[PDB]
């Protein structure tokens, strides 16, 4: 088939649970993400024939947010858009997407991505309409149903990560470890400019005030091995994981400019990247964190890579111990794995996530001029979406 | 290019708003439609690559609608699964997405459909999470503000069907006359057998009771002009729409087995039809029911047909007025089109009603020497989808 | 210290949960009984000095309901109002705390009763204003919170009834023959015209139509032992009480003018009563419903009176375990108590009950040789409150 | 009849919405003040006759605040409680009504005043019950709809001061004035100790911490007129009244204990003040500013008094435009009204504001020896209330 690559790769920065990004939409974000990622990639919006972005929590958001985020973002209505909801994959698997589209011959530029905000999602009442007739009921929280707690065993994510820890056998000392090692690389990154290529800023104007917002606010700088050890289980009583060793509740939005290799050639673009392959599957939901694992395995495979060849590795961290599990069991050089830094310490916007570490992946390859990347993320409700790149 | 086929078709029958599909969430409609499509097709669970399905009200729905869906039919875990919103256009969207996937290469079976639930939608509280401080607010319909409400002009689907009707000089009488032919036409179709192949009966498990719904309820039988000239006008006053020739609020699931020819070929499956083309495009938000349209010719031209050579025809009726332009304007032949009654008569479960139609195509054009098939459909934002479809 | 009268005795019909009143305001309801009461006092509403409304469920309803129903009955704006909440003694408190005024010297002639519309009660969302932050959170039904749930022990009405059955053993068998006695007295009474001259009609004013309610709605006609023996309990497992021998959720207004006896022979009024004697009590909140034991004793203290020397009871019948207890130890004859039937068949809107039974009181005493009337009443919370009359 | 007493008078600090005090329901700064109450009177939880307390905002508080109030201080469960709603007139009411109540002789000793929280108010969903059917639907402020909103003329209390500014031609320049005296004459008050005597602490103890609140929070120290001459119109376009020059929206309770004078004398109580008269009036709701006008001219009369003999004056302050209209009419002393300050400065917490003022009178003429004093409010729905007071 055609070959596939990306040509540019932004993001907003990844704003904390009720903090710099609260009053900006996730459609918003989409489109100050899309409108830089088009410039970067030297291309008209003229050019692109889809839009295909990832997001989890639409509730309220009115219809087609992917639609929505094109058109603030100046794409002309001609373009079809739409909205995936793959859980935490989804804003990978736009991707993997926008590459079969091409592959099937039906289009040369698709804008691809995700977008959340958390911090944004409503609360709800679902017997409003036809009446609650008698007693109590539950207000419900839309973000934690929706993104974060599982629809078969009735339980949250946290909890699936758990079951990770106890079976796989991961100490909560383990768990600190990952977790602070994620805080340190993050730190240093931000300190270092590591993301200035990635970034694009968000500028929010109030009544009065403008206010512009360009730096990862989820990390907890100096963070300590005792300043972990002391935090309380999360999940459940005598638990190994917490708020600590686990990610956040965050916004941000991240946005790929996906083209076939042909393309990019005609229209004078210097590729990024090319997508070697991907995979998606799934798994028994009770330890969803582990989805990677198979996913990484099928894309390998297809590629025909090992495991020892790749220079970068974005896995995504949803939890410690998920992250522990899938390094383990795929044999992973720890030092190649979340450079940068973890979802640990940069947050975790749930229909973006996949996306953002994908631009993460590529801006690193770039800087360091690593070749080989893979980039995979665990999935709530038990799948797992991985994919491979081979730099240009 | 490997071909694409349709094994199977089935859909639950089309529930009245607030009615006989009110207790059953549009994740078990899913689920019923899912097992007996795969029954229909004839294939092992274990064949299926990927669950790929259409629903706009997600909203307190749970992680991954699709996944649920797909859990609950009892379809293997390993399977992956995701949700697709795309307004009206989602269920028909499924079902193209799945052809360029295996013509990718990636897949050979998977799942696509929709499925949706308006009578369960909640309300919202979009403020809750963080305080409304003072004042009143807004109790939100999720379902009108996710499904019908326009994101950019603020305003109801209805609207857009009042600007069709004012630019092309649709008339009330011509609205009602062919709303009364979709009622005639859905009557004659239900009475005689027609849909008894497609649809798949819901049992609800009552307090001490079980109940079977298997029967599409939205058609007023011994409808008449008369009684159509009577009504008031919905949306505006003064306006040609009314809650007689625009279609209503409903719940239902319709899935598809789609499957490259070769794999049919080597499981003996017997092909209900070919997939030859398909298309999106997108229009000014404001008159988003000629979306088909362009849709329409797009597909047609990649097919090497013209409209004179269809046989069947399947062009959803959100609204009277749009449904006549877009048929005006691509010179159909209005005697085959919606044979068995549209969505006038039928019903309009958003999520699901890109995929219904496609099963009602498929299932007429079995029952005559039809040999090519249209379906089509508007999209709330300003968008169409259409495939075409040739008898195998 | 002045002699105390009552110169009329007005009530709506009670109206059961979601029914006939459903669309009628509170007061609207105490509106319509105001209006009634002066005309048939044949008072100048000049003459009125102050008006006090017993109301519990106020969530929703705009400042001062006493005030509101009080402006739209047509009462000249200079008369004062306030709302009074003492629960279920709240329509009797505020005819004690008339005399208590009058007794005092402050005023002549005051509008006294009690209003409320169960079926009306909203629900409510407690964090709202400064935001949930995170987590399900409960929809508050306020009608329960405010009307029948208990603040200090924790549970419903229901069970300080269970503890009363429990501590004093009184079976199922007796509370279902009181339950079966009170609605065959209802019935009877109903039939035979016993209400007709203290019910005020309520014309509702519909979309094309008008409707007139004027008729008790809770009265269940036709009930048998056989019927009331095969309830499952309402409260607790294997408890006694059941929706068959508790009163249920509803709708009334129950309005009363009360003057000086002075000022009675001043404007030739011809008094229906004289107020000889009340009283209010507090109880353990755990048996609630034993209020009225203390309060009648207190008020029949005062007035030098025994159990014996009354000729017509009115005990509510919030739940036939506690009325069966109170008039054990009170040692009432029953053939004297609650003649037309009790609150099991007419209903218990909680705002108005306590000057409803009044109402029933004075108007049964004007067709019979019945000298002393005793009305009481339980009051969620742990209280009682009763009143004394003497035929005029 | 019977002269009447106020043995002590205690409340606690005024809090500012949303701050010191949103972690405290009203019914515990109610049982905080009571328990104070009842010490500083000399007297036992055991001579106390009834509850009678304001409260306006009572929608999710459960069964009769005032009761829970009484319960929560440690009072008998024997005593009986009722809540008050005269609106912004309830704290006050409840003080006359209890010296009405002795006078009636039911009783010698009862605890009066009002609480509130408004802070805490929830928001509501009126149409929960039986469902909303379809469309967008308010969700309600509590507060306002209850406490702050006119509902015969359906605006703001605000509006009612406009209007009042108007007619009596009350110009911005003159209330910002009126506004900055107020502010301080508080701070003054303040810092120098005035209310020490009167504020009872209210100790919140949370999961770790524990905080004393003990100063009014409200008044803005340091006010300039240019300050307040900047702020913009509250209500209306082009409007007078602003929220520099209106009161706010506040947390407090304050309570007195009411004796009759041969009781006191009996428990060796030393009374600080007897009360002497009071009254209560209705007016046009449209200028229920004004409604102290009528109140204080009735209590005067009763009294036999004259405005030139008042010592100290207590007017409270809703709105600079009413009070300038009431001070003017009523020719007041200025330098008699508000000496510690008013209501703008200090706060407006609507159940308790009318016992807040009271008990900020009856310090100040002891810390004075002002020997006559009046108390009197405005009331939402057109009313007014009043009381006289006479040092002892």
Redesign the interface.
Same mark, same amino acid.
């Given at each position: $088939?055609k070959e596939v690559v990306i040509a540019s790769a932004v993001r907003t920065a990844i704003g904390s649970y009720?903090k710099s990004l #609260?009053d900006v939409p996730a459609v918003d974000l989409g489109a100050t993400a899309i409108k830089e990622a088009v410039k970067k990639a030297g291309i008209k919006p003229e050019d692109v024939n +889809?839009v295909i972005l990832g997001n /989890?929590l639409?509730?309220?958001?009115?219809?087609?947010? &992917? *639609?929505?985020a094109s058109?603030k973002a100046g794409l002309?209505? +001609?373009?079809?858009? $739409?909205?995936?909801?793959?859980?935490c994959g989804?804003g990978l698997?736009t991707v993997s997407?926008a &590459?079969?589209?091409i592959? &099937?011959? @039906?289009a040369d530029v698709i804008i691809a991505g995700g977008m959340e905000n958390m911090? *944004?999602?409503?609360? =709800?009442?679902?017997? &409003? *309409?036809?009446?609650?007739?008698?007693?109590?009921? #539950?207000? /419900? @929280? +839309? $973000?934690?149903? @929706?993104? =974060?707690? !599982?629809?078969?065993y009735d339980y949250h994510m946290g909890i699936t990560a758990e079951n990770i820890a106890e079976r796989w056998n991961i100490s909560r000392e383990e768990q600190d470890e990952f977790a602070l090692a994620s805080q340190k690389k993050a730190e240093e990154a931000i300190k270092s400019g590591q993301f200035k290529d990635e970034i694009v800023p968000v500028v929010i104007k109030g009544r009065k005030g403008e206010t512009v917002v360009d730096t990862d606010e989820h990390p907890r700088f100096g963070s300590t091995i005792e300043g972990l050890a002391k935090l309380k289980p999360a999940f459940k009583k005598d638990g190994t994981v917490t708020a600590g060793n686990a990610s956040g =509740?965050n916004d941000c939005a991240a946005v790929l400019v996906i083209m076939s290799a042909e393309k990019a050639k005609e229209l004078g673009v210097k590729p990024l990247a090319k997508i070697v392959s991907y995979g998606?599957?799934?798994? !028994?939901?009770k330890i969803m964190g582990y989805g990677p694992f198979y996913a990484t395995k099928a894309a390998i495979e297809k590629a025909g890579w090992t495991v020892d060849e790749l220079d970068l590795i974005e896995s995504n961290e949803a939890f410690a111990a998920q992250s522990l599990a899938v390094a383990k069991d795929l044999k992973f050089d720890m030092n190649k794995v979340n450079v940068n830094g973890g979802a640990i310490a940069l947050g975790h916007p749930i229909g973006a996530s996949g996306a953002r570490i994908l631009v993460t992946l590529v801006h690193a390859m770039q800087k360091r001029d690593a070749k080989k990347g893979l980039a995979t993320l665990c999935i709530?409700?038990?799948?797992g979406?991985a994919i491979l790149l081979e730099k240009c």
């Open positions: $088939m009720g #609260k +889809e /989890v639409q509730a309220g958001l009115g219809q087609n947010p &992917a *639609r929505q058109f002309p209505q +001609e373009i079809p858009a $739409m909205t995936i909801n793959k859980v989804s698997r997407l &590459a079969q589209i592959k &099937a011959g @039906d911090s *944004r999602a409503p609360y =709800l009442a679902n017997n &409003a *309409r036809w009446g609650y007739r008698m007693g109590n009921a #539950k207000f /419900v @929280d +839309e $973000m934690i149903t @929706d993104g =974060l707690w !599982d629809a078969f =509740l998606s599957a799934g798994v !028994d939901p709530g409700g038990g799948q979406t």
